[PDB]
C-alpha cells in the first residue's frame, strides 16, 4: 500500500511517495538524495513525536487511508548544525482571502 506525504522544514516542502512497509530510515535516505544531508543529520516527526529509524511508516500511524495523493500526510523534518539538533519549526502556508459574498 502506497503512502503519499510531504516532508516539511521551514519553507522547504518535499512531495514524495513511499510504501507502508518501508522504514523511517528509508525516508531519510530519500531526503538524503534530494537535499544532500546524511541520515544521521536528520530528525523526522509525525505531528510532535520523534520517529525511530527502525519503525515502519505504518507503525508510526501513516496508513494509506489517511496519507492519500490528494491529501498527503504532513511529516516534520529538523536538521543538525554540527553539534546539536535544531528545534522543529514549520512555517505555515498563506491564509486564503475571505470568501466573497457572491460565493456564499
Amino acid at each position: 500500500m502506497d503512502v503519499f506525504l510531504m516532508i516539511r522544514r521551514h519553507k522547504t516542502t518535499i512531495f514524495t511517495d513511499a510504501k507502508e512497509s518501508s522504514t523511517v530510515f528509508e525516508l531519510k535516505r530519500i531526503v538524503e538524495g534530494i537535499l544532500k544531508r546524511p541520515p544521521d543529520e536528520q530528525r523526522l516527526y509525525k505531528d510532535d513525536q520523534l520517529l525511530d529509524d527502525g519503525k515502519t511508516l505504518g507503525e508510526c500511524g501513516f496508513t494509506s487511508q489517511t496519507a492519500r495523493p490528494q491529501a498527503p500526510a504532513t511529516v516534520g523534518l529538523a536538521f543538525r548544525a554540527d553539534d546539536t539538533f535544531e528545534a522543529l519549526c514549520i512555517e505555515p502556508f498563506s491564509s486564503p482571502p475571505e470568501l466573497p459574498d457572491v460565493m456564499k
Binding site: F4, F15, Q70, P72, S94, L99
Partner: protein, 87 residues
C-alpha cells in the same frame, strides 16, 4: 527519480518530481530545474502540487478514481492558477 524546485510568491519552496511537474503544459515549456511564480501563493501552489501527485497516480488506473476535493475558500485562486498553468 529527478526533482524540480517550484518557488511561490511568498518564498515557499516546493520540491516535486520532474515527471509530476510535466503534467502542466506551462511548466513543460519553461523547463524545455528552478521555477518561480510571482502571482501564485503557497496555499494554492501546494494544492497544485497535490493535483500533480493525484493525476500521475490515478491516470491509466482502472481500479476506481477518488474525487479531488477543493474547499470553497481556495476554488477561485486555484482556478486562476490552473488556467495560467494549463493543467
Amino acid at each position: 527519480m529527478m526533482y524540480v524546485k517550484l518557488i511561490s510568491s511568498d518564498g515557499h519552496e516546493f520540491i516535486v518530481k520532474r515527471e509530476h511537474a510535466l503534467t502542466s503544459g506551462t511548466i513543460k515549456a519553461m523547463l524545455s530545474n528552478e521555477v518561480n511564480f510571482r502571482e501564485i501563493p503557497s496555499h494554492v501552489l501546494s494544492k497544485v502540487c497535490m493535483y500533480f501527485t493525484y493525476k500521475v497516480r490515478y491516470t491509466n488506473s482502472s481500479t476506481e478514481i477518488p474525487e479531488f476535493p477543493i474547499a470553497p475558500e481556495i476554488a477561485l485562486e486555484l482556478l486562476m492558477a490552473a488556467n495560467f498553468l494549463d493543467c
